[PDB]
Amino acid sequence: FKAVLFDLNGVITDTAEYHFRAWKALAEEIGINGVDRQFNEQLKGVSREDSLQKILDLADKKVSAEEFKELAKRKNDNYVKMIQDVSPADVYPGILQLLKDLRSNKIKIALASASKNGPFLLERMNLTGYFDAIADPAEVAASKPAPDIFIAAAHAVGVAPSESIGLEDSQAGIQAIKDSGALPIGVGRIVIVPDTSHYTLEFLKEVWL
Ligand SMILES: O=P(O)(O)OC[C@H]1O[C@@H](OP(=O)(O)O)[C@H](O)[C@@H](O)[C@@H]1O
Numbered sequence: 785f786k787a788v789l790f791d792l793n794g795v796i797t798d799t800a801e802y803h804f805r806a807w808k809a810l811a812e813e814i815g816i817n818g819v820d821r822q823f824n825e826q827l828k829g830v831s832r833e834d835s836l837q838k839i840l841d842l843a844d845k846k847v848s849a850e851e852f853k854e855l856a857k858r859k860n861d862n863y864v865k866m867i868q869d870v871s872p873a874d875v876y877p878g879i880l881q882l883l884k885d886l887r888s889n890k891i892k893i894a895l896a897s898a899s900k901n902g903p904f905l906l907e908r909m910n911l912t913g914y915f916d917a918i919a920d921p922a923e924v925a926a927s928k929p930a931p932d933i934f935i936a937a938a939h940a941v942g943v944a945p946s947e948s949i950g951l952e953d954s955q956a957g958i959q960a961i962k963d964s965g966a967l968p969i970g971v972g973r974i975v976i977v978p979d980t981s982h983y984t985l986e987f988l989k990e991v992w993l
């Protein structure tokens with residue numbers, strides 16, 4: 785194995801709560817009831833545009849293509865203010881060490897997140913240096929569960945998805961990894977780890993075989 789493709793939220797850190805808060809604020813702003821925690825599970829690793837459609841689907845309010853755009857920027861502007869306080873403190877357990885062990889063992893590291901804020905978040909956590917590249921969700925043809933972002937992360941570091949491990953916390957993201965041809969190891973409640981402190985290189989390798 786040659787590369788590890790990282791989900792961001794759920795793996796490196798998680799800004800899920802800020803994400804939900806900003807979508808809540810938006811839904812309340814547009815009078816669209818019932819965007820709750822239970823609903824927000826449905827939003828993990830989905831792009832901003834996809835997340836909004838699912839919110840908009842609730843009230844079956846069509847908002848012809850320019851409006852839809854704007855509401856996304858509103859939600860983004862809020863969410864961006866909320867994550868100004870991210871720091872190296874929000875690094876998930878065992879992730880720094882893993883990054884370190886990866887790079888020292890000559891395994892490429894790429895970000896395969898659905899989030900356009902991935903680079904900002906990575907910079908705040910002082911993690912930029914570890915990443916050999918970042919899949920641009922702007923360039924990518926479809927969000928998780930499509931494989932496109934994982935294919936793009938692998939390509940960025942000069943590897944096939946088939947020479948890669950993908951690390952994920954949502955089912956759509958697992959599905960995206962599986963279908964890229966890379967190897968999923970998830971974290972949450974078919975290899976599954978209870979938490980990111982079990983994501984050590986020794987484990988990752990032992991799973992490869
Ligand atoms: O461009 P944005 O609005 O910042 O990000 C889009 C999405 O990024 C995803 O990050 P990930 O794929 O888990 O690392 C989040 O899980 C998802 O809840 C969010 O809608």
Ligand SMILES: [Mg+2]
Nearest residue numbers: 791793794829
């Ligand atoms: Mg995620």
